Amino acid sequence: GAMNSSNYAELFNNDIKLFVDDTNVYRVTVHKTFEGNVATKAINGCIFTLNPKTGHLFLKIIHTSVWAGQKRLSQLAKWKTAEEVSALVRSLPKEEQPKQIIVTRKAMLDPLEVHMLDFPNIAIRPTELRLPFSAAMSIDKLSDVVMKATEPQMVLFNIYDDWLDRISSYTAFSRLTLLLRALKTNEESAKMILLSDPTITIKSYHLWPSFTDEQWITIESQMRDLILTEYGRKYNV
Amino acid sequence: MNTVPFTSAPIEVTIGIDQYSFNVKENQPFHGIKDIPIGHVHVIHFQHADNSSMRYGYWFDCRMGNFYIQYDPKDGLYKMMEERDGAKFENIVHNFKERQMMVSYPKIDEDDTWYNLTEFVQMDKIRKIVRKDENQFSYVDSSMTTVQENELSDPAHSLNYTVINFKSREAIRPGHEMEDFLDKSYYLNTVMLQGIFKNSSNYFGELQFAFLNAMFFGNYGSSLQWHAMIELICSSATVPKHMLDKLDEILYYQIKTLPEQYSDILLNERVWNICLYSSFQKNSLHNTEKIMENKYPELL
Ligand SMILES: N=C(COc1ccccc1)NO
């Protein structure tokens, strides 16, 4: 069934699972036409498919050509996502195929279920968690490869860099979701926090800076700051 | 006009014969039902006064044999039987008619209700849904489950309706996932009509039989089947014009006949709102939409 706070450690057990987030698949800018009407212009997007235990990210880039001449694009986008996830599963060796796929939005349940009919033993699950994966396009290297794509493309990343050498996957996922929640709530400030110190760099083969254990504690504190200070400004506390 | 005699009525019971019902008291001198119209299937059904649990009954066609009812005190129910001795039967019936011990099928001459509810229903197809090949008539009751229900437990006592499942490989062509899920025409016209049912008459017959079992017996799996068969047509963009027109007439008479106070359990809000207001055929069921809006506006 649905995934929530009560069954959160299940993410880090040894059953292979993937999160699928479709938020950034169909992206547009809205603008005025010469006649003063409104139109949309699509820009490149991506499917965010993540193994939360290993950090492996399968970033399928969605090039704007896939929308040419199509109608009802927001609906098509969900089916295209499901097609691409199904294609990815079929491409993996049997022993790497997931046992469960968790979709971050419930509107992906039926499209994915239909595309995976051939895989009756893979569970398709929703979640009650409000995960911040939409903010993936605030990670500079991910945004860069999506916007530069001139054709459909899959790019593989480890979204945890080398963190699992030093911390568990529960802690790594917690750090990731904190970083992404901060980038989603106030991107400019979150990015200021992460790069303010010119002496801490991002390795060529990494996504995030090379913080020591102690610096991650400072960084993580600065991000909380931000999320709790917003909550109050948004509601009252 | 044919007759279904009763040996006796040892237990107090409400007896249905099609849309009509009457009460028989314990050991009242009741010996059956006469003047049953030839040319239609019929259902004779029972609800005991002591235990309203278990509505049960029999589908039959008087052209296929001479049938009677006899209470069984061991199994505790009124059983249909076939009498093979034609002269014994004619003689039994004539004596009961002479003593005026039989009630009369009270068909108003203007009234086409039963025809309209059973237009496509044939005994031979009933007997393939309800398997008991040694009898010419078919027993159904409130509790019998469907083949599809047993997949999600006694097979000999099941309703073998055609399984419809919108998220199934039968329903969804590889490479047409979005197309086939959002427009069910492939599944309706190729898989079901051409492949399984062969024609729309057999499709409508099963739809009508499912409705009647839902209504007369409270059979939940039959209600599920009726709604699935409606939804499959309404969710198809491409349906023959004659099928839509006939479906509207079929549903109109079903909604007209439904007891007002059973609508809450016999009608699925989601299916009907989708069919009448969101689906491809939202504008093709004028008679059904008009009666639904005037009789059951709450459901919508
Ligand atoms: N029309 C009726 C009652 O019809 C009958 C039939 C046979 C004997 C008595 C009454 N209820 O719907």
Side-chain angles (χ1 to χ4, degrees), chain A, chain B residues 1-151 154-300:
Chain A
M3 212 270 297
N4 53 29
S5 291
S6 305
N7 54 22
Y8 181 73
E10 185 179 12
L11 298 178
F12 316 110
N13 75 12
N14 288 82
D15 290 356
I16 301 174
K17 44 181 69 67
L18 297 170
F19 280 113
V20 175
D21 187 90
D22 69 316
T23 299
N24 286 307
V25 169
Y26 173 51
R27 300 208 283 163
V28 301
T29 55
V30 179
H31 60 86
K32 279 289 191 60
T33 72
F34 182 84
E35 295 72 38
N37 308 121
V38 176
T40 58
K41 186 193 150 302
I43 62 164
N44 290 344
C46 58
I47 306 165
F48 180 96
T49 299
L50 172 64
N51 186 328
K53 177 96 170 162
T54 60
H56 288 195
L57 171 61
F58 301 86
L59 192 78
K60 177 65 192 228
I61 305 182
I62 301 303
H63 185 262
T64 60
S65 64
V66 308
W67 313 125
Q70 309 295 322
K71 273 102 179 73
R72 292 191 50 89
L73 296 181
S74 64
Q75 174 181 261
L76 177 64
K78 298 171 200 314
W79 290 88
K80 173 61 173 189
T81 298
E83 188 184 11
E84 290 293 347
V85 170
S86 169
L88 168 65
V89 170
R90 297 164 201 277
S91 80
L92 292 164
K94 194 189 185 211
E95 72 274 2
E96 300 179 33
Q97 291 174 341
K99 299 294 177 147
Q100 294 172 14
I101 299 170
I102 305 158
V103 300
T104 61
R105 311 198 290 176
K106 307 193 209 66
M108 281 299 308
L109 287 170
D110 278 353
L112 193 54
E113 164 165 11
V114 173
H115 271 278
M116 306 283 289
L117 293 170
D118 290 340
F119 292 96
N121 302 341
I122 301 187
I124 308 301
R125 303 176 59 205
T127 181
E128 295 304 337
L129 304 180
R130 41 276 192 180
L131 294 161
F133 295 146
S134 71
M137 288 297 97
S138 294
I139 301 174
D140 287 327
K141 289 185 181 187
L142 302 187
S143 184
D144 286 351
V145 67
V146 169
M147 291 314 288
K148 296 188 204 300
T150 58
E151 41 179 326
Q153 174 181 9
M154 162 85 90
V155 187
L156 312 186
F157 295 91
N158 186 323
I159 203 163
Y160 295 154
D161 292 343
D162 60 351
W163 301 343
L164 291 179
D165 295 349
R166 305 196 59 81
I167 65 181
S168 67
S169 66
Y170 177 107
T171 300
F173 191 76
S174 293
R175 181 182 289 164
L176 173 67
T177 61
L178 174 63
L179 290 171
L180 292 174
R181 180 57 66 194
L183 289 160
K184 191 173 175 170
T185 314
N186 189 335
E187 186 184 13
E188 188 221 318
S189 306
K191 290 192 174 197
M192 286 180 62
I193 289 170
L194 286 166
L195 327 170
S196 50
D197 181 340
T199 77
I200 315 169
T201 65
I202 301 172
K203 295 295 140 298
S204 57
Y205 50 86
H206 281 169
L207 292 175
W208 312 95
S210 299
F211 290 123
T212 60
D213 291 9
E214 299 311 312
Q215 290 174 339
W216 270 123
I217 300 286
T218 302
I219 293 299
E220 293 170 327
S221 165
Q222 290 176 354
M223 291 300 191
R224 283 188 295 271
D225 306 340
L226 223 138
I227 301 151
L228 291 186
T229 294
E230 215 53 80
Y231 202 79
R233 270 147 146 161
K234 186 170 273 183
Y235 307 93
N236 229 313
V237 116
Chain B
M1 311 303 277
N2 277 124
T3 300
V4 170
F6 277 51
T7 295
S8 66
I11 66 162
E12 200 153 288
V13 63
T14 301
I15 300 178
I17 178 69
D18 308 348
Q19 73 264 48
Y20 317 115
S21 69
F22 57 96
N23 293 304
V24 177
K25 294 297 171 296
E26 178 194 311
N27 284 304
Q28 172 190 325
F30 171 81
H31 288 291
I33 308 169
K34 61 179 205 165
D35 302 327
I36 302 165
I38 311 170
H40 307 116
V41 307
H42 297 286
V43 60
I44 185 169
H45 43 115
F46 301 93
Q47 188 151 226
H48 299 178
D50 60 11
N51 169 72
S52 59
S53 313
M54 183 191 51
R55 277 180 268 168
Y56 60 98
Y58 305 86
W59 290 94
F60 67 95
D61 182 335
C62 282
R63 295 172 286 191
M64 291 170 58
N66 296 317
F67 308 113
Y68 64 102
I69 298 288
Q70 185 166 114
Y71 184 70
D72 178 8
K74 177 156 162 87
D75 288 348
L77 78 181
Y78 287 96
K79 289 189 172 162
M80 178 161 283
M81 305 206 273
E82 179 168 357
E83 177 58 69
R84 80 158 287 120
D85 183 357
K88 177 175 189 182
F89 189 81
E90 291 177 15
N91 171 235
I92 284 297
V93 170
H94 173 271
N95 174 90
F96 287 160
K97 284 199 190 176
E98 270 293 83
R99 307 221 293 147
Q100 296 198 39
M101 299 271 87
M102 296 174 161
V103 293
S104 160
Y105 187 94
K107 197 178 157 309
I108 300 322
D109 309 285
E110 155 193 57
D111 180 23
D112 267 356
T113 292
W114 189 243
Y115 174 74
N116 293 335
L117 292 169
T118 63
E119 179 175 359
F120 301 99
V121 180
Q122 335 170 262
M123 256 326 294
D124 63 79
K125 300 306 206 304
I126 291 180
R127 296 184 70 228
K128 301 176 196 312
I129 297 171
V130 189
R131 313 189 156 288
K132 193 170 202 267
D133 290 335
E134 62 274 17
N135 297 325
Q136 293 285 289
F137 49 82
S138 300
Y139 171 92
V140 181
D141 68 28
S142 293
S143 69
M144 283 166 50
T145 51
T146 67
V147 168
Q148 171 172 68
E149 282 183 302
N150 295 325
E151 302 164 358
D154 182 27
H157 210 58
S158 281
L159 298 162
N160 302 276
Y161 294 118
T162 293
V163 176
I164 299 176
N165 175 2
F166 297 140
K167 296 192 286 188
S168 75
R169 171 57 64 221
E170 294 75 19
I172 302 290
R173 285 175 298 178
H176 303 253
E177 290 83 1
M178 186 189 196
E179 170 179 19
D180 280 355
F181 186 73
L182 290 179
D183 171 8
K184 317 226 178 264
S185 297
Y186 157 72
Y187 191 34
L188 168 67
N189 290 298
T190 302
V191 179
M192 289 280 167
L193 285 175
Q194 176 183 280
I196 299 189
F197 286 98
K198 305 310 178 182
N199 52 68
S200 55
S201 296
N202 292 334
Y203 189 99
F204 289 143
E206 185 170 328
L207 182 155
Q208 285 183 315
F209 183 57
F211 170 77
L212 292 167
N213 288 322
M215 177 175 59
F216 286 131
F217 303 115
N219 188 269
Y220 177 80
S222 295
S223 184
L224 286 178
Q225 186 64 16
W226 177 55
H227 287 90
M229 297 189 77
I230 295 172
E231 189 170 5
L232 173 57
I233 291 170
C234 293
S235 302
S236 297
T238 303
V239 182
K241 316 87 173 51
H242 71 276
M243 259 190 90
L244 295 171
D245 286 339
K246 181 63 67 160
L247 177 64
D248 192 32
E249 291 305 316
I250 285 165
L251 300 177
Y252 173 80
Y253 286 105
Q254 289 174 338
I255 299 304
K256 179 174 174 65
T257 303
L258 264 184
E260 301 67 30
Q261 304 289 334
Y262 288 36
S263 41
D264 38 303
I265 52 194
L266 288 172
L267 294 175
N268 185 279
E269 181 183 68
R270 178 196 70 86
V271 171
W272 281 98
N273 276 275
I274 274 55
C275 289
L276 296 179
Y277 301 123
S278 328
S279 73
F280 288 107
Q281 306 304 339
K282 63 193 175 304
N283 294 317
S284 312
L285 306 175
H286 304 110
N287 294 353
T288 295
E289 179 171 307
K290 189 173 295 311
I291 193 172
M292 282 287 290
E293 291 184 354
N294 280 285
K295 192 180 182 196
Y296 298 121
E298 327 84 42
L299 189 80
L300 322 162

